[PDB]
Subunit: 464 residues, 4 copies
């Protein structure tokens, strides 16, 4: 029958199609070209992003050394002030170093007029302290008369062209935070020399003296925001080429999916009517090609990411996160799709089919063990949280347990529990039981069962 022959044309391997009709498999070549071009585009994007990130990080480190009093490398998380004098000296040192920046900095930084932020009236530096509107606190008499309104008092500082901030008085009893805003603009000379494209950076520096905890310890932070700007192509052409290749692949895959859907409809209308027997939904799902779904998803992701990258490279978006995520996911998807080419040979198809037939039982076992994992996570978070640095937050607990079951950072956890004793022998004994039981169970039973499932699936595939 015509339907039988047309269905036989479907599901044949590309080699069989070439034997039957002598049509060159140009779709396969197109997909290979797509893999190559998307990988090249991702590599170039990554190299440029690496350069930009390195420049930003080095400038931020230089700013930290320039403006933070007594700063040392590797102490960002513990850098804090503990006395009123320390806070005053830190703030004054930051402002003073700002005021004499041209004659001390190794980098060519230029002041930005009006860069003090929204709280500045055109001054380059803004020194703002925020405190509660009314903050009469009396721990001795147990008085908490508090007005939750926040009051922002700012001091405007301007650099000399070509000292009222010294009279700053803090409100420690009701202080919330102290912030310093200013902007510095410079030129990336490596970009000037190498790629001849003049990139002029603008760093927005924010120094925070955070007292939101009101715990007597005020951490000190320095953060930067960068605005790239051209200051008075092969990449764009390659991006256009990538977009065109992805669009062509998407069109071909969509047409193939439509043809498969039409063939499925013809088969079902023939079988339900001429033969009378009703067919199931699995017979419908057999007609779809999951590889084509993967390909169209990768094409859509690549097209969106390439549009975003074109916008970014023209200094218009500066939103690298979403574009990078899209491009990386698309590249991963195409490199996974290479498995379809690998599946056309039975020797590789044995292993691929072993994985495919093992997947359902593996997922079921994952569902079975997820509840035990979650119970252990909750118990560890609630009990060992106050006493263990690795159990402070639920995500941290999950990461610690996942590392434990894979044999990483075990003795560190045990020694952390041992050194402080947990401030209670009962807590220490519970931690011993908890860790030993969890590691023993998840390593010597769950992993072994995963291995057993995979081995059984391989045995079934090898001996049908």
């Amino acid at each position: 029958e015509d339907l039988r022959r047309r269905l036989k044309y479907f599901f044949m391997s590309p080699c069989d199609k070439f034997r039957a009709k002598g049509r060159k498999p140009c779709k396969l070549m197109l997909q290979v070209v797509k893999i190559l071009v998307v990988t090249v585009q991702l590599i170039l994007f990554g190299l440029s992003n690496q350069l930009v990130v390195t420049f930003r990080e080095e400038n931020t480190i230089a700013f930290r050394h320039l403006f933070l009093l007594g700063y040392s490398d590797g102490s960002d998380d513990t850098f804090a002030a503990y006395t009123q004098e320390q806070l005053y000296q830190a703030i004054f040192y930051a402002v003073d170093q700002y005021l004499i920046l041209p004659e001390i900095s190794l980098g060519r930084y230029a002041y930005v007029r009006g860069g003090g932020g929204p709280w500045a009236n055109g001054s380059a530096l803004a020194l703002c302290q925020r405190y509660y509107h009314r903050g009469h606190v009396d721990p001795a008499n147990d008085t908490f008369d508090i007005d939750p309104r926040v009051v922002t008092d700012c001091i405007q500082v301007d650099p000399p062209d070509r000292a009222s901030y010294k009279n700053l008085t803090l409100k420690f009893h009701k202080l919330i935070n102290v912030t310093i805003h200013f902007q510095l603009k410079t030129i990336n000379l490596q970009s000037l020399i190498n790629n001849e494209i003049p990139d002029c950076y603008t760093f927005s520096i924010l120094i925070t003296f955070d007292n939101k905890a009101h715990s007597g310890r005020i951490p000190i932070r320095l953060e930067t925001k960068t605005h790239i700007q051209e200051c008075k192509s092969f990449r764009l052409l390659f991006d256009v080429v990538v977009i065109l290749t992805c669009s062509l692949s998407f069109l071909l895959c969509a047409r193939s999916l439509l043809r498969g859907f039409l063939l499925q409809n013809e088969f079902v209308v023939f079988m339900w009517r001429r033969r009378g027997r009703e067919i199931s939904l699995w017979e419908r799902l057999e007609f779809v090609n999951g590889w084509y779904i993967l390909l169209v998803t990768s094409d859509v992701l690549t097209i969106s990411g390439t549009v975003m990258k074109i916008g970014i490279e023209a200094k218009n978006l500066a939103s690298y996160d979403v574009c990078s995520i899209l491009l990386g996911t698309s590249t991963l998807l195409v490199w996974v799709g290479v498995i379809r080419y690998l599946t056309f040979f039975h020797k590789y198809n044995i292993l691929i089919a072993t994985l495919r037939v093992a997947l359902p039982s593996v997922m079921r076992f994952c569902c079975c063990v997820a509840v035990i994992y979650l119970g252990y996570c909750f118990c560890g978070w609630i009990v060992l949280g106050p006493y263990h640095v690795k159990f402070r937050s639920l995500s941290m607990v999950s990461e610690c347990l996942f590392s434990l079951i894979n044999g990483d950072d075990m003795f560190v956890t045990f020694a952390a529990m041992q050194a402080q004793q947990g401030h209670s022998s009962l807590v220490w004994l519970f931690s011993q039981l908890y860790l030993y039981s969890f590691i023993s169970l998840f390593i010597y039973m769950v992993l072994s069962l995963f291995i057993a499932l995979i081995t059984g699936a391989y045995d079934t595939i090898k001996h049908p």
Copy 2:
């Protein structure tokens, strides 16, 4: 027979019971609701405890920076004095910083009159040194005339309202320890702003200069004890709801267990008399439902923990350890009990039954390997203890070996043995043999046998 039909009603799946009698499985819904409510209660308790712990830790760090002379972060375990001058300066610095606390601290701390402890006569700070009653020690002449009575000499220090301690003279040759007791009370402003509940903390600060070792090195420690106190609801209602749900679940499960016991009694009295044949204890154990035992245990633990949490949240107990342990264990138990729902489908029941039938042989192999593990622990503790930081105590030895068999911190152990050489080539050679033999055996035979046991159990389950 009536007994046969009633026993057939027992052991049927919930779906079969619904088919037979059309009774909605409301016990299952009750257990799901119980899981949800206990998880929510545990999450809320954990968040509040996290806030309290963070506040306490930050205040303790601030106190360490304020009162410990030359203190630096990350040096608590090595912070010590080595000369008489160092000890004198440390003590005097602590007291002096206490006396000028209001004008230097970033936190609003208030003095506590009469907070010097039992050894104070109403003074805020107590500076006590403890020494032996008679301590004439002559290492040159080998004289050890010692009276083991301890003498406590205290100095009372009071802060100014709105210097005799400078004449302190120590008895180094017979000194036991020097301690400083005082209390500071403050207000948690985050609690004031966010949850509007005024919490007034009271920190009991104890600085210890410990000379109990009499080894010429005196470690210096700072410890704090916190007493939370309200200073002049949804949580309680949710706790009551959790208690009621757990009580209802406990009642239903106990009634089901009683019905099962009655059915077992009827079956045994029918079989032993009418049929004459004596039945075994395993036939008795078959009639019990282990899931119901787990559920009633979790209910009891949750009820006790919720009562303790209600007491704690009213500022009456301040004993978080036991309540947290009970709540975490109950949450873990219910999340494990979810496996009973998972067992009603044969696809998941295959894996669950594989684990169940593998458990006995796994336990037997654990018994077999425990003696070898203990022998290795004892040998390592006795030999490598004097030369390895990881082998100082038996629990430390067990943790190190358990980490070793799971492939963690191996090269660190080897390098620790190598760097010092063990001060003997014989000890180094023994350590090489010990570590290599232990790791090789336990990784390449014991773990492989665990995998083999699990695989065999899975093979038996898959092919009955």
Copy 3:
């Protein structure tokens, strides 16, 4: 026949022997008692050794802080002098701190007259510098006129009762090392208070300024040797009890081995003569009991270790290493021997026999993989040795590779190779190939084959 019945009495389980003759298995009870007593003795010995080691280590740390100029904790391996002034100040600081020790030390240390060592003429401190007899070295003119004779010039320093060393002049161009010898004696007050046994320690302190490398960097070390001495029982009785129990067990096991040998001789003389057929050596080996060999070995080791421990506890040997090794090995052996009791039940015997029948093929595979492991060790040592801290010595290379195959410290090795680049791209590429190939092979083939061997042995045992 009589021989058949007597041989049948041999090899029966203890339960079968009890059934046959009604003889209480008192040898088993004796061995259990032996296990208990040796474990208790080892635990007590370990606790006492822990106390002694802690005291010695704390005193050594105090000495390092007292006598080493600018010393900081955790910098022993890098503590060195780099200029002539630094060396002079270090030596002078050490001697000056020695001369004013009583008025600065927190520990009660007494001077030891005549403790300066062999190079002192009765003075308490000896300051000796060693240099070549003739050391005219001219790097500019390439002159190496050297007399390898070493000349020791000493300066005698005596503490005041109840400054010529300042004129010390070094010979840097030919200097070998500078050493400082003195002794301090003290009293362990914890021993005085707790166990009432007066222990008077004598520390031999040696400070070394080593210039044997002649590399312009002189490391500085402080080492101590301790001589314990009583200064003007249950333990001994328990040691005697342990010795008696071990001797009785040794006698019984030797008698049993002799009886087995006699039975083997009777069987062989009957079979070779009456039956004519010649029997093999495996039939001889079947008659021996390996558990009895283990027991007699453990008894001999325990007896030797207990004699040494008795000698040590009387302050006569001070050689803890050999005694500790003997005692630990004996304890490990008896805890392993518990497996014989475990073997009397078939459920545990299944696993034990699985291990026993897997052992030969496991050993053969170990022989197969040892040559590859050794080749990789040699290649890594010769190539990556100059560029990797983990490949400096052959034992270090072996430890690093053994940790690598067990999934420990992998990224650390990779990052160490990456950070310095190996000072050559060829070396970096070779390191990449070397590490990837080694880890891949040994993890994904060798370990899998070990698992396969164990699984096959278990399959053979389970299905005979």
Copy 4:
């Protein structure tokens, strides 16, 4: 037939050949001797290289402490200057320490006249700064008038026999780097005393103040190049012996390969003509001996490495990398070739054949998983690169992922992602999904499938 008998002589085991013809297997003894001699030569070479490397490293550390202002151990990667004053003080300190080296150094270092490098006119020290020809940069006005020509301005410094550099003025706005070149020569006294061979080292010291990044932070580096020179045997004889043994082994193996090729040619010309049937290429490959190929490769590598080592030991090449690589590869190859001896016994041949028959499917599975691994590498590099220190470069990403799949440095990666939050919740969520999916897949499916493949191959070998 004659051909059948001659082919039967081929492929027989050495024991069978000895039985047939009584010829002593002297080739096997020659190969054993070769293994021994190459291992001994490699060990001696490694020991000498260890001594040289240790001397060079110690001298470099001494130079770093002598010439780098404020240098501390373990801070090479972060050592940098951040102000103009800091750079000036660092440069001046380096030059000043050079000028007074004889009276401060602990090592006997001699000045080298004319050692300032190509940029020196015979002076011992060269202080050169490099800057752009025209470097008018105006970040405020966005001006980048740049002439990419580099201008090198040098200052010549000469040590006193038996201060114009103080007037050095830098061009920070256009500075590229500042370098200091000088040479110091010394004598290795350990070589003088121990092996009596006078080795006179010449260190070329280069201090770099790198401003190529133009980021306001100037890293400071010290690098040394060493030229060994004899200054006014058993090793050579052993090298000659090794060369002769390798040449003899190569000749014998080549002759055996030629004989095998001739036998293959005779067999093919007989079978294709007399029998008519055409044979395949696998029948040709069966006649070759892979062990002989391994042996000749190892012989060639050893001969080349020994020639290079002979050249090096005469102070003529100083290129240790290539020689070490060749020697290590040859030693690894011969230690692998020991497996051929192991293959002559069927008990070991079982395991060896298991590995051999598992190799093809293992390679196919590696090809299958390589594409997924590469996709994950690309995605991680592009996304987590800006936010993770472990994902900066593609090789670093590959090393991190390879360590992750083997259960190493997992929690460190998770905590690195957690601590900074990735500066975006979307990036953090993506990192969670990425890491969890990658680790789960590669550990619980890929490794299990490798184990299953090995187990299946072992099952096929065990039960033919």
